[PDB]
């Protein structure tokens, strides 16, 4: 069916620029309006603008004017969004969502944002990409500490240990580094994967 796929999560230092892509499939690209909507983590939704992929005509929300640039390449049916001079408070999941048809006399309906992409989390901070420090919580788990950026993935016994494991949300310390802990309820080994920094660590839990 209709599937929108967006590019990978990007981590950038304030003042830099980013380019996000939105691959369309299962529909005629030039047929439908292509909108962008961002959501700050745990915050509400914010409309930014639409592009007519057919004509190329653009419309920005007032507070998105002057730094947001939207283009499209109909050859590969991919919409592009270029954010310039990024600020810390511009950390959000950036979504592309399909509008209604692009011709004057409208068939079907005005089904706005009937289909969304998976999102692009654009993280901006003065902090640098930091690999985590993992420590075992001995019994009477693993503490995953001091990492940026967020994600982080914790496997147990090379991923064999699946039952009783609980992974807690991360806290954003004053350092601007994240910290989470995952708890386990013969030999137990710790395998934490930090994809954004390409870091893996092994640790033992005795």
């Amino acid at each position: 069916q209709v599937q929108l796929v967006q590019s990978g999560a990007e981590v950038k230092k304030p003042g830099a620029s980013v380019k996000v892509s939105c691959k369309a499939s299962g529909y005629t690209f030039t047929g439908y309006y292509m909108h962008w909507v961002r959501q700050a983590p745990g915050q509400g939704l914010e409309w930014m603008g639409w592009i007519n992929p057919n004509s190329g005509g653009t419309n920005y929300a007032q507070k998105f004017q002057g730094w947001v640039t939207m283009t499209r390449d109909t050859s590969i049916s991919t919409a592009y969004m270029e954010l310039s001079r990024l600020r810390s408070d511009d950390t959000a999941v950036y979504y592309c969502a399909r509008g209604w048809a692009t011709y004057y006399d409208i068939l079907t309906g005005y089904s706005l944002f009937d289909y969304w992409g998976q999102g692009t989390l654009v993280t901006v901070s003065s902090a640098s990409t930091k690999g985590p420090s993992v420590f075992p919580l001995a019994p009477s788990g693993c503490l995953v500490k001091d990492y940026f950026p967020e994600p982080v993935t914790v496997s147990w016994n090379s991923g064999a240990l699946t039952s009783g494991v609980h992974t807690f949300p991360a806290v954003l310390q004053s350092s601007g580094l994240y910290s989470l802990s995952s708890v386990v309820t013969q030999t137990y080994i710790c395998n934490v994967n930090h994809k954004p920094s390409n870091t893996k660590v092994d640790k033992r839990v005795e």
Partner: protein, 213 residues
């Protein structure tokens, strides 16, 4: 924006209505009001479009109306799966056509039994200590509702510096969980006889204690 109610509650198998107050330039002028339901970790899902109309594979339980300058979404026959964030959207622009969204509404599906939290305290690891660092971890994992307060004590007396706490969050069990961290120095850790994690939940505390000896 349009002004939406921050939070709405109801009991299972009943109906509620979520307002979405706009101006004459949006909801008043156009019959292009849409509603979206967003679950945690997932993009929003089109539920309602053109004020009243419903997409294919959305349940009949989701009705849409609009009177004057305010929109409303009614969910008949409340199920547990309906617990999510509900945004309202409308076409705007007298001579400048734009899209505007709503501030959002968290719907709570009542009935889930109240559960006292379950506290676990881990001491600093010796291998963390060898890095000239020490951290105590407080995990609260099996409580409803999802409102807790954590407070740290060193030798019975309150400490508030180097506390990094998470806001509570739901689990697979559909019971809320929070974590608390106390970042110490090895000097502080060794120099005290006890360290405590007091978790208050609806007028009641569960305190766990750990000792460096």
């Amino acid at each position: 924006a349009l002004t939406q109610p921050a939070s709405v509650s109801g009991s299972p198998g009943q109906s509620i209505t979520i307002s979405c107050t706009g101006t004459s330039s949006d909801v008043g002028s156009y019959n292009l009001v849409s509603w979206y339901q967003q679950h945690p970790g997932k993009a929003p899902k089109l539920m309602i479009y053109e004020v009243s109309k419903r997409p294919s594979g959305v349940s009949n339980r989701f009705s849409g109306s609009k009177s004057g300058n305010t929109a409303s979404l009614t969910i008949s026959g409340l199920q547990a799966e309906d617990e999510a964030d509900y945004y309202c959207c409308s076409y705007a622009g007298s001579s400048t056509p734009h899209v505007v969204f709503g501030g959002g509404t968290k719907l709570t599906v009542l009935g889930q039994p109240k559960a006292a939290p379950s506290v676990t305290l881990f001491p600093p690891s010796s291998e963390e200590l060898q890095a000239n660092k020490a951290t105590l971890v407080c995990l609260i994992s099996d409580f409803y509702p999802g409102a807790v307060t954590v407070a740290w004590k060193a030798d019975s007396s309150p400490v508030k510096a180097g506390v990094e706490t998470t806001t509570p969050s739901k689990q697979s069990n559909n019971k809320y969980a929070a974590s608390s961290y106390l970042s110490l120095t090895p000097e502080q850790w060794k120099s005290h006889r006890s360290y405590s994690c007091q978790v208050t939940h609806e007028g009641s505390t569960v305190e766990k204690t750990v000792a460096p000896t």
